[PDB]
């Protein structure tokens, strides 16, 4: 079964793997905590699930335009595959890139830390099938919901900038809903 817990920022284990449920968390604030955890526990693996439920505060049109500009205007005139940027669009890849920006650059310790992170959209079936799945939340990185506040989810961003890819993933969820519901 799934067991929900609050992550103790001073009682992180030195070994093993912790799973963080990203639902309702602010993307940049959760990334900050995740980046620090990976650096301060060089043997711990961190799994983030439900990455498509991460929240970005601000007006929807403002957030989408920001992503549109990143995936459209940022390019190279040299060999694009050899020298240019490669902008992620899917929420799990987007969030992992956000964490990369909060890790040391061009050093092994920054690279090793990112290799110890896995990000998933929704909850993978193998994680679900486990006898006891412990899912953590980070309350200081959670969105405090207030009236008339604007925000979007990484899933809504993905739908805006890659509709066909989002539709397939959405259909896959429907196809496997019965088996996921069984587990």
């Amino acid at each position: 079964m799934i067991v929900k817990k609050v992550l103790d920022l001073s009682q992180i284990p030195e070994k093993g793997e912790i799973v963080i449920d990203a639902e309702g968390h602010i993307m940049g604030r959760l990334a900050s905590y995740v980046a620090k955890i990976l650096l301060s526990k060089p043997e711990l693996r961190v799994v983030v699930v439900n990455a498509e439920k991460l929240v970005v505060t601000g007006d929807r049109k403002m957030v989408v335009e920001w992503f549109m500009r990143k995936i459209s205007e940022w390019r190279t005139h040299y060999n694009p595959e050899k020298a240019g940027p490669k902008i992620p669009r899917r929420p799990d890849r987007v969030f992992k890139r956000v964490v990369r920006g909060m890790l040391p650059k061009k050093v092994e310790s920054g690279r090793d830390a990112l290799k110890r992170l896995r990000v998933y959209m929704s909850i993978p079936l193998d994680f679900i099938q486990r006898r006891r799945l412990v899912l953590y939340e980070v309350p200081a990185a959670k969105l405090r919901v207030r009236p008339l506040m604007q925000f979007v989810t990484l899933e809504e961003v993905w739908r805006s900038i890659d509709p066909a890819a989002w539709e397939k993933w959405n259909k896959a969820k429907e196809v496997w809903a019965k088996k996921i519901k069984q587990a």
Partner: protein
């Protein structure tokens, strides 16, 4: 910018202009067609040659309506495809990727398939079909694995080509699966897939031309008043500004041809059963003779004169469909 405006030389939509990774076309897109019955959504055939035909124009609004017009046509040598396996696809819930979940093979594959595949002496087909059925409820797409039969073609080679062709025609996945399983071990003829007069897309690797210069590769101009220029005239003048440096959009010499290309909306003029009626008495130059079924396509097709060509149902058909009746091919230039 430029002193006088003009479009760029050549497309950058086919960058990089490298040799195709495979001589067999790999089709990325297959249309969703409602035919009322299950069927393969494509076919594979060998390009034999080109002729011209006298065809009666059947487009009622056309200015040439009802007249006899001469059209260049491409002849495809199309022996029946042999169905070797059935593969099922689902969607990976993690990312929505299409993923194969299993496949069932014919028990006794033909000996020529052993030239390309590492096969067991016998496939236990019933177990594989049983395992396949467990994934029926998560299936989103079903495709057959077909092998060409080049011995029945004019090429006469023995090594076959193997590729996947989906089953479509009805929206119900289950009937497509049942139809695909019924095809295991049987052949598929072009008339089982297409009907004369319909439009198809064609996908093939184009004819190879080796290393070519920038004039031929991109259409850059030979330097005007050609004799004036020291260090040659079949070249660009400059290869870039000072910044950014050589960009990937600068025309450069390199491989030309042997690329995969897709052309749309080619009309099937005739699907014949015996190629002796279309083969010229001299034979098809650099190809040979056609003895089995053939496809007569209106227009030209990418590829050299023995290339395997994939025909599929169109993905960008025009608004007005062609007439239902078969087109009237009065005469073909290979005949008396």
């Amino acid at each position: 910018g430029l002193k006088i405006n003009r479009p760029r030389r050549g497309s950058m939509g086919v960058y990089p202009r490298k040799r195709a990774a495979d001589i067999v076309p790999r089709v990325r897109t297959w249309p969703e067609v409602n035919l009322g019955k299950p069927t393969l959504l494509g076919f594979a055939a060998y390009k034999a040659g080109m002729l011209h035909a006298v065809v009666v124009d059947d487009r009622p609004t056309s200015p040439l309506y009802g007249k006899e017009v001469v059209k260049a046509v491409t002849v495809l040598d199309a022996p029946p495809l042999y169905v070797a396996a059935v593969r099922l696809y689902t969607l990976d819930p993690t990312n929505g990727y299409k993923v194969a979940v299993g496949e069932a093979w014919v028990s006794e594959p033909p000996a020529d398939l052993r030239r390309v595949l590492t096969l067991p002496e016998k496939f236990d087909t019933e177990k594989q079909l049983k395992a396949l059925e467990e994934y029926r409820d998560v299936a989103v797409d079903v495709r057959v694995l077909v092998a060409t039969q080049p011995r029945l073609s004019g090429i006469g080679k023995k090594t076959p080509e193997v590729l996947e062709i989906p089953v479509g025609g009805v929206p119900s996945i289950d009937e497509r699966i049942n139809f695909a399983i019924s095809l295991l071990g049987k052949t598929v003829s072009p008339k089982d897939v297409f009907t004369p007069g319909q439009l198809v897309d064609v996908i093939a690797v184009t004819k190879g031309k080796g290393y070519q210069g920038v004039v031929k590769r991109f259409g850059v101009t030979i330097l005007p008043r050609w004799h004036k220029h020291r260090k040659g005239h079949r070249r660009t003048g400059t290869i870039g500004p000072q910044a950014p440096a050589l960009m990937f959009t600068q025309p450069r010499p390199g491989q030309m041809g042997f690329h995969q290309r897709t052309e749309y909306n080619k009309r099937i003029l005739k699907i014949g059963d015996n190629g002796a009626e279309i083969t010229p008495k001299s034979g098809f130059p650099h190809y040979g003779v056609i003895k089995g079924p053939y496809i007569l396509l209106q227009g030209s097709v990418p590829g050299a004169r023995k290339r395997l060509v994939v025909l599929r149902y169109p993905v960008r058909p025009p608004k007005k469909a062609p007439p239902a009746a078969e087109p009237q091919v009065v005469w073909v230039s290979s005949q008396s």
